[PDB]
Amino acid sequence: PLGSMTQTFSSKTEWRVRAISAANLHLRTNHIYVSSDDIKETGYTYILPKNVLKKFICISDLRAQIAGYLYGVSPPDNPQVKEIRCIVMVPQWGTHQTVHLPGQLPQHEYLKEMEPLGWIHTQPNESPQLSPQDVTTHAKIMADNPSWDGEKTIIITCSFTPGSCTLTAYKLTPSGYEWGRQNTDKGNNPKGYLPSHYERVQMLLSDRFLGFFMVPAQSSWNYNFMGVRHDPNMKYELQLANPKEFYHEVHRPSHFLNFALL
């Protein structure tokens, strides 16, 4: 029946609860874990420093994936171990399944003597299998950039487990690179996607050395609130500085200016 009632609608936006939840991400850096032996020995041991790993966790979002390019070298006489020495944040936006990085790779003088070791990204849920989107994205980067060798570049996923963070690092197989560079299906079960397309590598966290960050020279890296101005063909340059948190003021200018408009 009604005609008996008045109830006016209220607004509740997507980022309010996610921003409040992003402020408590520092408690997960005290509990970081890496998967261990499950026929994972590759021929390359990757060592990730904790300082840039903890910072990469707190500047992230628990649902929107963020990514960072890996750079590093090898110890004096041990070509089998790769020390990750730098993480580069580039203009990006993403969802819960993949990220959207520009076509251009990081290019700077500081990284000229280092070799690219792949990329690292956060994942909402822990997965026993490598993401098929990660298989597709990693292979398409190999196709456009011969700098990335299939036996030297890896995909490190930072899984958001309750109370902690689980790390696991995969690499692509020759069969995975050929299927990834052709894949146009973005679903969770694309066709041709096999567990044969990837194998897991070993990863070790260390405190004996420290890494550094490189962020865009002008604007910042987070574009999830400015996705219109993000373009796959966009060009960018880097600087030697640390990245800002996901919900920093400079990442969402429309929230601050539209509220000020009368």
Partner: protein, 1725 residues
Amino acid sequence: LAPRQVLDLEDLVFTQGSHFMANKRCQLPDGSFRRQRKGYEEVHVPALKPKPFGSEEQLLPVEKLPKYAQAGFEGFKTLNRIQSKLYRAALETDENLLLCAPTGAGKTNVALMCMLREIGKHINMDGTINVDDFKIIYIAPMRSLVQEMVGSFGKRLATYGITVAELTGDHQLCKEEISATQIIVCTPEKWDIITRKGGERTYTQLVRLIILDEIHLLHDDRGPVLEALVARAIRNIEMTQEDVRLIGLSATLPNYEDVATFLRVDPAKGLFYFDNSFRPVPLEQTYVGITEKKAIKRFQIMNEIVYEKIMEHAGKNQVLVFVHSRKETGKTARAIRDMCLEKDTLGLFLREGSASTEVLRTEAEQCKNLELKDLLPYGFAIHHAGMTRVDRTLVEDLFADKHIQVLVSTATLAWGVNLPAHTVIIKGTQVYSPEKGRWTELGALDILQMLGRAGRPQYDTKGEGILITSHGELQYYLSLLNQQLPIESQMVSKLPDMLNAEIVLGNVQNAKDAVNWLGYAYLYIRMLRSPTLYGISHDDLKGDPLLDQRRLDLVHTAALMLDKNNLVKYDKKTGNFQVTELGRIASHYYITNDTVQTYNQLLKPTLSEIELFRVFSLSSEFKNITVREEEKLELQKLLERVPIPVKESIEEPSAKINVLLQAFISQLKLEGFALMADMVYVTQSAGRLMRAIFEIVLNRGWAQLTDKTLNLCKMIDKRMWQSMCPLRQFRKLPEEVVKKIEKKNFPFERLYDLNHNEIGELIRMPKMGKTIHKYVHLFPKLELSVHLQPITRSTLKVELTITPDFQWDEKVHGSSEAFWILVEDVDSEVILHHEYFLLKAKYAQDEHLITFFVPVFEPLPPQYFIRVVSDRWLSCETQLPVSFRHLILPEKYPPPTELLDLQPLPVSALRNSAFESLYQDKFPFFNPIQTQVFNTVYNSDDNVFVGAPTGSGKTICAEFAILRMLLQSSEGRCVYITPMEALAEQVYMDWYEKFQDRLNKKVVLLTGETSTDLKLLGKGNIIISTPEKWDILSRRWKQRKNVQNINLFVVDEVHLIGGENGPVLEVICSRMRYISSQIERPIRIVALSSSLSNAKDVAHWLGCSATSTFNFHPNVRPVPLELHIQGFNISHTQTRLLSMAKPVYHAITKHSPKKPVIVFVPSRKQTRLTAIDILTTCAADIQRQRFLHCTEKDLIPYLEKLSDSTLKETLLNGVGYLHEGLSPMERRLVEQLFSSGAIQVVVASRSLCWGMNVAAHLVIIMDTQYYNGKIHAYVDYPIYDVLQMVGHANRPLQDDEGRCVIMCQGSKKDFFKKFLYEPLPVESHLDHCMHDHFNAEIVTKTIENKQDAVDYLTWTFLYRRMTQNPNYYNLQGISHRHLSDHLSELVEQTLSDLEQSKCISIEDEMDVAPLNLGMIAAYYYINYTTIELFSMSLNAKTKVRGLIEIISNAAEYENIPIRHHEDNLLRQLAQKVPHKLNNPKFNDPHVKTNLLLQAHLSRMQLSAELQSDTEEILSKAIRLIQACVDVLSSNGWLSPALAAMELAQMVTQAMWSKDSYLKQLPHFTSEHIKRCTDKGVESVFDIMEMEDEERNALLQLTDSQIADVARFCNRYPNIELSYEVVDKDSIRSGGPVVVLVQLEREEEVTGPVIAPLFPQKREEGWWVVIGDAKSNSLISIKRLTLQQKAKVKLDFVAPATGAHNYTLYFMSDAYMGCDQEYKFSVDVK
């Protein structure tokens, strides 16, 4: 003390505050009646009659006043009734006054008479008088009243040269006001926070008069602030015994006797009470009490009460209606006006076709206000602070001219404007208090001020005041306005916050101090005379007559509350208070103690912007804020759009405060009336609240939260978010274009790349091309450079160069621009270092250098970060990454020389009875260090380096080399170099008794004077000197044998090469290597130093064998050193020093209760304070005179020879202190009592750590910083000073060990651990002092070309370190070709600078040769920059005036500090001189010496110890005068040369060329110079020509004193001149001409030169000058040192033919009146 009991402070709180009605009944005057009306009652009180002139009351005219004060009463013919009864007590007495009179009686002028008496205490004779000698503080209750009286007092006292100004908003540096002003007008809260921040860079100690206007504010909630100000000022009187006059002005209200006792006012002298009858205009009072409870009916009932009373004056009298808000002012003005139209009663306001109806309508046409044009033509108007400034005066000007008939305003007009009206209506007495979160009654001051405007003392016979309020508040306002509302104290509410303020200031250190301080509060006096009102029975008062136990319980309750919130550390048994950094911030930022507890609990480094706002939400200043049901709808519509999310729900008041803060930054006007008031109160206090959070998290090192907090401080001040383009911070720029840029998304940092006509095509505009381009380059921007200088592998020295890349404009930047230098680590989480940088406007285009130290670890980090953020500008930051990828670290220092476990060597090892007799009475055997080097120094000639800690006995090892020199040749010449003059004086005293008194050698001490040093060098076997003192002599070594015939060269404390004056020490020692290699056979060099990490570099530089190098490290000291480094958290220096006072005492009882102790303090003032401090804490434990180990009566033989106040008191209790201000006799008396064991503790300042002849068992270093007077910043102790202070904790034959406690700031704790437990790494800095030495080597022909300059640089220590640590000297490689390039550029730039100053010549870019200007600078040891302007300024007609102004601007005088507490001493000394000056600038370190030079020539003795400033100026004046003499005579100038040659003798005897030449004989007076009236005596030669039995009969002096007069005449230059011209017949023009001049003296060789007013002992120098009249043509000049008989040969050239008459001059540089003048004639053929 006794058993305490905790009280409930809030239970003793008067909740009504200002509305508290202590009196319970109210008696009304005669004739008062009440009427009953429509649900409301009225009360009428008739106007009182003035009391008949009873006593001797005659209105005093201004002509009777003291005349100096008549200028302040321009425009008044006669004082009124109350001012005539006060003028004698105000102008002719210093008594504290308390004046109660009704508002309008004229209390202000009485306060002006008190100010005029103080101004007359510091007046001069030149009309314009000393404004640097006093300060007056006028405390007014309201902001508007302050601003008005600043101009009011400014014009009344403009004829006195007085500056009256209101303090700025926030001036943590912009406090240039106080020192410039003399009358400070402020609010109680303003003067409370300034005196809270108790740094004695203040000017509050200059306050001689404090005026407390409207002191009946004590009854108000703001009352306790007045109690805190008076208690702080009165208690501080007895802690200093400098009287401060207190003047209180009050309304006529009860308890005025208690206010008087609280102000220390004698009732029989300073108490003056006048009732409401003394109101100049009688006031007919009418009160309307409404009883209606419903809001809507009561709203219109009073809307009818206003109109009924408006009509009773409509047309007859103006009516001024007061309302609470600035929105009801228009509604009420309309509710009245619009309702008269219903009754047609507006024609009675104005007379229709009047003369004022046309002026009211016409001024409304150009009124510019819509809610004023609507009401102005009809006679209505409004007034409030939220509208125009010039329309308010339009409202005031019309009402003053009797044009406006109804004016509806608020309390602002009543306070800041003197606008009386016949009828005043207070429409309602209800106001909304956002602090209390509810509606409440108006304050008592607002009511008294509003009704005080009723009745014009000009036209009106009486005044009619109408007050409308609730019926329940009738008894209150009847008491307030009829002198029956008692003034009570609201102090127990704010007791915790105000006790902590005294704890932070140091005025209260324990509970007993707090009980004493509480006894000065107005609360205490009220508790004594009315204990019932303050919860005190008679079961308590007379069992505690002075309420001593009651005060202790209150203090005990407040201390526990502060201890629970971690502001204070309160020990219940001792009652002692310990200040904290958190407690200081709450005090200095005016934050209640409950708020800083919340900040301490919730502030975390991992805090986001979301929780940061929430922490601000929980401030206890908002404890009363609630969420009303009528606001939750408008607030929830904002919560769904806030940019910073809020976690708490809408109903909790925390969320309401959060949304109101974000809305204020977004500039959103809201509709809720309470919300707008609550938003204002939340953000009016958000400024200091967030500023406190910033200081908390910055001083903790939290880098991320500091950035967020500092940004929020600016987002609140600028009212804008970060994401908004920062161009809107220019208010002259319009919102217009900044969103024209904001909508088109591109970074603001890109518009710098564009230009005028291209910024516009971006934002689609060809109009304002240069406008945006102008403000883009007006935005502050700094560019950062970095020179990384590694010290070790864990300490990095950084030189940050700040280059401004913007343009200044006082319209935008003002006088300064503040920045925060932040050095963050790799992860941008920890602030490794931070300091405050301020860009002054005068240096807005120069580069700024900043030096600091940061730690590093040897898995080298990727990079650190340096951020320079603006302190007020938003989006204003430059971060410079400092990569460590190419940083070359120096190698780890080699291990020390192992201390071989040798057998202790006896004194018999010397095997010389004379030698052994110097040590066998002191110690049995040598220490393990002296035994290792014995064979290498005593039985060898190889160069030896001995590096050992301070106190290792290195002085004897140097004596080992001296004793060997005397064995190989009884005539041995040894030069001992020590860096500090204080050390040279001590070593000379010790070595004069050993080598000269016992073994009969010659020990000399260089004086810094050439005429004496060159001869002491030749006749002495041991020469003691300082670096610069030996640099002057060893330069001319090629022409002096006594410099190169050295047998042994000893340099002590050679680790001071890395110090400030290091390069001079490095130059002289490296010269000794060059001389010894070029000479026949080598000269022995022995080097002593503290433990050096790179000791092998000094050995290789000084040519010491590896086996002869003894590099010991601090772990091998003979007496074990127990070092303790306590860290202190407090960043405020004065508050940190307080936190160290008690720990200083506690360290004494723990480490050395019985054995002597030395405490080092940063300043002279701190010596006396810490000594007193140590005493009373020793007295608090009931242990007085425990530091006195001699009986009390065996000290007066030493104790009455003193001249100090407290030094006698402290020495009687076993504690002394040393500082520069004490006389040399006083220091010896304190040092003797300390070493004799009498007194156990002595407190010495840092400046004396090099000249102290005592040693203790424990050395306490209280703080490691001192204040620099020039740069106005604190300076860290040099590491060499700390090493020297620690070395005083060494008594080898008295204590088994040595202990030292170092108290420092936490940021310096790790620095001292790395440079005290390990050896010290020293570097060179000669590359920054190359010019003065390169010039000397070119004059002496050591450097003849550019290749020779590189060869000279290779002998230095500067070069050895350029390969061990290249980055310290800006080098990217230790390559050999890298060194030549660096050495060459250092050579090229140094030789080019000397050639630009015309000091040297450069031919074919290779060869260099010295010029005459360079030969003079090197001869007299003068900076090349000084001698450059020593040719720009001098000329041919210079004389005694131009000379002094030139020599004062020398670079050698840009070192002594400046005191601007002196500025008016020099203001008058600029005319105490008989010699005129033109330029102002009295901070100039050269002009202050120009007056100081003439102060010496005027015998103006006593300058506290500025006397020593002159003594160091005279130490360089002679060499500067002789420089001009050479410069002027070289240019052929006769008069300025001769005038300068007799200024040398003017500064020698401290006189002029005008005074008689008899002021030289001792005990001569400047008065009985004219006692030689016409007796024929004005030369010294006349005094000896009279008989001995006669000549004592005119001076009238002692037979003790004429022997001093005789000693001078026995040494007065008695001579005999004989001159001849060789071959005065055959003279052709252009041929060799020669004139010899023989000078035969009598005897002389009788000591040096008699000059008691000169510090040094000079030798008689002489000049032989030939000239030609005063044509200013000097033709010959020669210097000579006469001993008895000596001739001088002068050659010149003959000019043309004819007959020229030449003049011969024989002048000296010491005595006046001995300048001979002979005349001869030459016939040239």
